[PDB]
Structure formats: C-alpha cells, structure tokens
C-alpha cells in the first residue's frame, strides 16, 4: 500500500515492465515512473532513480505531453536488465519539484511469492463438438506463479489468428491457472494439422514451453 497520504499535489504512478519485455532477450523491458499534475508554473521535474538504494543515472525521458486539461505529463523510462528484475531487485523512483514540500519515494519490485512452474496439458475437442463447422482447441495452464505471464497459440510456424486466452485466475492452492481457447475449422483438424500452445513464464526452463497434439493409439 504505497499510499502515504498527504495533501493536494502532483501525483506519481510507477509502472512495471511488460511481461514479454521481461521474457524475450531480443526485447527491452522498461520500468515506468509516471508524473501528473505538473503546473505550467512549475514544470520542472527532478527524477532520482535509486535502485535498491543505489542512485543510478541513464534514465531517459520521452517528450512531455501537454494534456487537454492543460497539465503536463512526463514519463521516465528506466531500461532494466532481465535478470535484475526476476531476482526481485527493487526499483525506487524519487521525484523532485520545487512545489513539493517533501520528495516522493514510490517503490516497486517484482511480485512476491513462490514462483511456481506451470503444468501444461493440451485438450482435444469434445466429440459432441465434432458435429459443428468450427471446433474448439483447448490449452490448459495451471500451477503458475506469479500470475504475470504471456501465452500464444501457433500453427505451421505461424501464430494462429483466432485463439483466446483468459486473464490469470487465482487457484485454490494460492497459485493461478488459466485457459487459452484456440478455434479452428473442422477440416484442418481432421486433416490432422498440428497445433501448438506456447507459454512464456519466469519459472519455465528457458522461460518457455510448448505442447503438441496428434492422434495416439497406444
């Protein structure tokens, strides 16, 4: 509850990186300190970026945007090292402005709690569905933590254009589970096309896993 109450001033919101940003090394994860209620009178903003207490620099700044309501908006993006974030390193944003009696110490860091590796199970359509023009392909994802995650569906080396994935849901064991539903024409399935559910999470080897599906007598 980083909500130390005071009185009427500019406000700061500090936003975590996008998961995929956290997940692909060929991507750039960012922490975001957002400042609102900057006056034209006092538009000067100072950023301090204590990391675990170690002041860093090399924070950048996108151009200020005048809001319709005539306040300024300023965004600061601190580039983050992948391994820094997952180990739960703390990122502290300090905001200085002459109109503020005291400095702001918004704090963030990765969600706490035992990371848990997801189990992935793929499920074919019910026979009852086999009567329809379209069929449902199910990917079950459960046992994961934190709920932060990215999921994709693929076919023939390409993402499928028509799957849906649920928001994380809190399981009874304190963990989360979710479902992603991929929809495909009956012909393609019965023609024996191979479909893949792709999942990206902190706690998987290489932060990645997939499961495949085709008939299997035994």
């Amino acid at each position: 509850c980083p909500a130390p109450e005071l009185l009427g001033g500019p406000s700061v919101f500090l936003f975590p990186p996008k998961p995929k940003d956290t997940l692909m090394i060929s991507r750039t994860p960012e922490v975001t300190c957002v400042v609102v209620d900057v006056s034209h009178e006092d538009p000067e903003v100072k950023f301090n970026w204590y990391v675990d207490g170690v002041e860093v620099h090399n924070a950048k700044t996108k151009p200020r945007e005048e809001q319709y309501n005539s306040t300024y908006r300023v965004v600061s993006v601190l580039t983050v090292l992948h391994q820094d974030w997952l180990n739960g390193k703390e990122y502290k944003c300090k905001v200085s402005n002459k109109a503020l009696p005291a400095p702001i110490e918004k704090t963030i860091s990765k969600a706490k709690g035992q990371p848990r590796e997801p189990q992935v199970y793929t499920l074919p359509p019910s026979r009852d569905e086999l009567t329809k023009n379209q069929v449902s392909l199910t990917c079950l994802v459960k046992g994961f933590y934190p709920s932060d995650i990215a999921v994709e569906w693929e076919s023939n080396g390409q993402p499928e254009n028509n799957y849906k994935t649920t928001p994380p849901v809190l399981d009874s064991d304190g963990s989360f589970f979710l479902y992603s539903k991929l929809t495909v024409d009956k012909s393609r399935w019965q023609q024996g096309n191979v479909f893949s559910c792709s999942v990206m999470h902190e706690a998987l080897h290489n932060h990645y896993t997939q499961k495949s599906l085709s008939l299997s007598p035994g």
């Binding site: 001033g9 005539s70 306040t71």
Partner: peptide, 18 residues
C-alpha cells in the same frame, strides 16, 4: 476543494492546487 481547474471554450488554461 483541491486540484481546481478553470475552462475557457472547453480548454483548461489554469490549474490551482488551492
């Protein structure tokens, strides 16, 4: 009341903390 805004022809031109 705090964070008071004044509008002219739809455009906010002045903000007041107090």
């Amino acid at each position: 009341v705090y964070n008071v805004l004044y509008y002219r022809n739809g455009k906010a031109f002045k903000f007041f903390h107090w």
